[PDB]
Amino acid sequence: GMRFLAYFGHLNIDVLISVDSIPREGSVNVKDLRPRFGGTAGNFAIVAQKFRIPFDLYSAVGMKTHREYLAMIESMGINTGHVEKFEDESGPICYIATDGKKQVSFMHQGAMAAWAPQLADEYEYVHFSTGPNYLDMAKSIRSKIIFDPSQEIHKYSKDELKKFHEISYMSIFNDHEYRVFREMTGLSSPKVTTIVTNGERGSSLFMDGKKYDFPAIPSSGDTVGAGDSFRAGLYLALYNRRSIEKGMIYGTIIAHHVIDDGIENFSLNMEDLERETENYRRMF
Amino acid sequence: MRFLAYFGHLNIDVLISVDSIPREGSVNVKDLRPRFGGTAGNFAIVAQKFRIPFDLYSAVGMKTHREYLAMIESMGINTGHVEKFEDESGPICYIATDGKKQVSFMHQGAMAAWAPQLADEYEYVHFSTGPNYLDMAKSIRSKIIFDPSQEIHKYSKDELKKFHEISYMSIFNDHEYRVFREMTGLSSPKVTTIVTNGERGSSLFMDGKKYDFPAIPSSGDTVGAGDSFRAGLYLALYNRRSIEKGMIYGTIIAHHVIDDGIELNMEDLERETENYRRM
């Protein structure tokens, strides 16, 4: 039987290393050390799971570093059957040294660089975010493909970018990545329906040769994973067979609540979401 | 009464290899691997190969040190006096390297939450790196070996002089001995003192004399060379040999670990020791 969504991304661990001053060379004392479990797949999964959106998470992790992350998401009821587990690898893991006035990130792909993804079953939607060899999978399947390259926009050639975009049902970018895309490809406007997020300011939808703007709801809190909350709202709409406008609004409202409340203490009933969505729609 | 209580770090070095360490932003990690080390760890590994009876005193955070404990336990090293903090991580050092340059981010973690208590009576107590061990040292009647190492700077002028005066022996590398003399204002030692100087060997300051022990020409991994030397020193002390014997034992064991690798018969050591004496 055909499933709803296969979602491809990273289950990244950020090791946050807080120091007074990052030196040029030599040692410095770590004031605070803590991990943050995230990445493109992880942040989506955690929010999407809270809404009971069906999805098969596709990723690759190194068991030298990712045992606790796997245990956490599995405890939330998230199926890790399509997450490749490399016993003698570490990663994806990023060591982030910070003083406030500077930041240095040491990114170890590890397991994600070792992975040869294979699409198991047939899906209505396949979301390709960060990771290896996605265009080879994209080309061969008949699913509605969402192209979401994020920080990996630079690894694709001009023809790979135009190809992946043209075969996609929708492409998603942030403001910077859209400029890089247009520039790398030579496309002035999108060939397919395209979402361009713009952090605190909101997001835009390029569709039918027109640009529709979705202003952000004022928020105050942790913005880490706000894009993934937004994507979870989009899929909530798609799952319920709602309009893309509805999906943009759902994403906007959900991103806002997760920033303000935090995903742990965040609940939201569909009745509120729907009322808030029609209010938003009438106002703009 | 037990032979030795050895205080130090069970340090995990997270070696992060990159093509170039950036001023800001990200960089891809070419190679990522752990190295289990520290003063307590490197000593414990070598000392256990010679079956020297010691009680390792340390503090580790279970968030990061479970595979380290696993390794030393599989070598037969008892971790009964290694404090195990469930909520803490560390001691752990994140070392970013590009060949030309290096940056270290040291997290004491469990070592910063440790309040050491000395359980049994010991003949020898070796205080290397960790908390201010002077409060313990003051109270005990054991033969104290003061080995401040990279933490020489944390002790005040009076603390350095005190710890040194109460010690049976003090041990330093060349840099730490300079630091020691400048902070305390002492031109020469007050108690028997060993000063190591890598490839140039080591010196024993005893009875107002300096006895030089040139190193045995080696080529290999120098990580833990000083800790191997200390294991040879305690091998002679365990077998009731003289200090001169310990210096030679240390010079030979260090050399063998550099050349032959960590992963020696007592009769072989006794003959090699005799051959060292005759140049």
Side-chain angles (χ1 to χ4, degrees), chain A residues 1-23 25-30 32-49 51-67 69-100 102-121 123-138 140-199 202-263 265-270 272-280 283-284, chain B residues 1 3-22 24-29 31-48 50 52-66 68-99 101-116 118-134 136-137 139-156 158-189 191-198 201-240 242-259 261-262 264-266 268-269 272-273 276:
Chain A
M2 153 157 129
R3 322 192 180 19
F4 179 66
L5 181 58
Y7 200 105
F8 283 79
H10 282 65
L11 286 171
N12 194 61
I13 296 186
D14 285 333
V15 174
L16 307 172
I17 301 162
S18 309
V19 300
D20 281 347
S21 182
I22 300 171
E25 173 157 29
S27 64
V28 58
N29 188 248
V30 176
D32 186 78
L33 184 69
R34 64 182 70 177
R36 166 167 70 206
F37 297 167
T40 44
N43 289 333
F44 176 77
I46 295 170
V47 186
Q49 180 69 7
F51 290 92
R52 306 175 175 181
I53 300 171
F55 63 89
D56 287 358
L57 200 57
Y58 282 82
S59 199
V61 303
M63 304 300 275
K64 293 289 182 187
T65 53
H66 286 55
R67 286 177 179 277
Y69 197 166
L70 289 174
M72 187 189 66
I73 65 181
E74 290 167 353
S75 70
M76 296 170 183
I78 301 174
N79 185 29
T80 61
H82 296 106
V83 178
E84 183 62 31
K85 298 161 199 82
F86 288 93
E87 192 70 11
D88 302 323
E89 290 267 1
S90 62
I93 185 147
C94 189
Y95 299 94
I96 306 173
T98 321
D99 65 21
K102 209 167 72 181
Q103 175 170 311
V104 186
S105 288
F106 305 96
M107 181 68 222
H108 175 68
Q109 296 290 338
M112 286 296 289
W115 191 38
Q118 192 156 220
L119 205 37
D121 318 318
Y123 297 88
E124 186 174 346
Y125 295 93
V126 175
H127 188 114
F128 290 118
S129 70
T130 55
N133 315 139
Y134 296 166
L135 181 59
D136 294 295
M137 285 186 281
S140 59
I141 68 185
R142 282 189 168 76
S143 302
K144 282 108 95 187
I145 299 172
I146 287 64
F147 178 50
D148 182 16
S150 179
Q151 305 129 307
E152 294 179 3
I153 193 71
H154 293 273
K155 81 186 184 175
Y156 298 89
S157 68
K158 181 177 89 164
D159 290 343
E160 291 175 339
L161 282 181
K162 285 174 65 172
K163 178 81 165 204
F164 214 151
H165 174 72
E166 290 163 19
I167 71 185
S168 67
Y169 175 70
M170 291 191 295
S171 288
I172 309 184
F173 303 106
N174 71 8
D175 183 58
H176 186 61
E177 297 152 359
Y178 185 59
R179 298 199 212 86
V180 176
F181 176 79
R182 287 184 267 166
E183 188 172 66
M184 286 178 177
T185 62
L187 302 174
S188 43
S189 74
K191 297 183 76 67
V192 305
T193 304
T194 300
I195 297 170
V196 183
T197 62
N198 195 15
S203 57
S204 297
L205 177 58
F206 291 83
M207 190 179 61
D208 310 329
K210 296 182 171 186
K211 175 182 151 70
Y212 301 95
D213 295 327
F214 296 88
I217 298 169
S219 310
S220 195
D222 188 9
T223 310
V224 167
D228 302 312
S229 298
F230 180 94
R231 286 156 177 75
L234 182 57
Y235 282 105
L236 180 58
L238 293 174
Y239 185 63
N240 289 293
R241 304 285 172 239
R242 299 284 154 248
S243 55
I244 298 179
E245 184 185 29
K246 213 92 162 193
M248 297 293 288
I249 299 175
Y250 279 14
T252 302
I253 295 167
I254 292 171
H256 158 68
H257 283 105
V258 171
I259 291 161
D260 284 15
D261 305 348
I263 190 57
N265 292 245
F266 166 63
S267 63
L268 179 61
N269 65 81
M270 300 308 86
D272 277 320
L273 178 54
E274 201 73 347
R275 188 185 48 78
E276 291 178 37
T277 296
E278 301 303 302
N279 287 160
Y280 189 99
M283 304 172 111
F284 299 118
Chain B
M1 154 159 133
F3 178 64
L4 177 59
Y6 202 99
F7 288 75
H9 279 72
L10 289 172
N11 178 44
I12 297 182
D13 282 342
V14 175
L15 310 181
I16 306 170
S17 303
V18 296
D19 284 332
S20 183
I21 298 182
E24 188 167 354
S26 56
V27 59
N28 187 248
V29 174
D31 188 70
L32 181 66
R33 58 183 63 190
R35 173 170 58 197
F36 301 152
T39 47
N42 293 323
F43 171 85
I45 293 163
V46 180
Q48 193 64 19
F50 297 95
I52 301 183
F54 65 89
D55 284 6
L56 198 67
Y57 281 77
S58 202
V60 305
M62 304 301 273
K63 293 292 195 172
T64 52
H65 283 54
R66 288 185 155 95
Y68 198 150
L69 292 169
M71 200 196 67
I72 68 190
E73 285 159 355
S74 66
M75 295 172 176
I77 307 175
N78 190 58
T79 61
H81 293 109
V82 174
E83 194 68 37
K84 302 180 185 71
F85 291 86
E86 291 287 309
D87 273 75
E88 298 286 337
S89 60
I92 184 160
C93 192
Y94 303 93
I95 308 173
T97 316
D98 64 6
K101 170 190 175 190
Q102 169 168 316
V103 177
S104 299
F105 304 97
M106 179 66 212
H107 184 66
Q108 295 297 334
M111 291 291 281
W114 190 37
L118 199 41
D120 304 62
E121 300 178 14
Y122 293 88
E123 191 180 0
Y124 291 99
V125 178
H126 189 104
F127 291 117
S128 75
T129 54
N132 201 332
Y133 295 137
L134 188 54
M136 278 183 48
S139 65
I140 66 175
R141 283 188 167 79
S142 312
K143 278 170 283 183
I144 296 167
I145 292 71
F146 176 50
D147 185 15
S149 186
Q150 322 95 233
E151 300 182 352
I152 191 78
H153 292 287
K154 84 180 192 158
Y155 301 90
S156 67
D158 293 319
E159 287 176 324
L160 277 175
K161 286 188 74 176
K162 179 51 175 172
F163 218 143
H164 180 66
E165 285 167 9
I166 72 182
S167 73
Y168 174 70
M169 288 188 301
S170 287
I171 180 166
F172 306 101
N173 66 22
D174 188 54
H175 174 66
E176 297 149 5
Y177 187 57
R178 292 167 174 271
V179 186
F180 178 77
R181 287 180 281 174
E182 193 176 345
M183 284 178 293
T184 62
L186 296 173
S187 56
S188 60
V191 304
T192 299
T193 299
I194 300 172
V195 178
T196 60
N197 200 2
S202 60
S203 298
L204 172 65
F205 288 82
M206 187 175 63
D207 303 325
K209 295 174 178 179
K210 175 175 164 66
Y211 305 98
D212 302 311
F213 292 80
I216 300 175
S218 310
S219 68
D221 184 14
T222 313
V223 177
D227 300 311
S228 300
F229 177 93
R230 288 159 174 76
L233 185 58
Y234 284 106
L235 185 55
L237 292 178
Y238 180 57
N239 285 288
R240 307 290 166 172
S242 58
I243 184 50
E244 170 178 322
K245 203 91 169 191
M247 301 296 286
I248 297 170
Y249 277 26
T251 300
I252 292 174
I253 292 176
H255 164 72
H256 267 82
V257 170
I258 293 170
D259 286 13
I262 189 55
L264 183 60
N265 191 292
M266 206 63 45
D268 291 342
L269 176 56
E272 286 183 33
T273 292
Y276 179 99

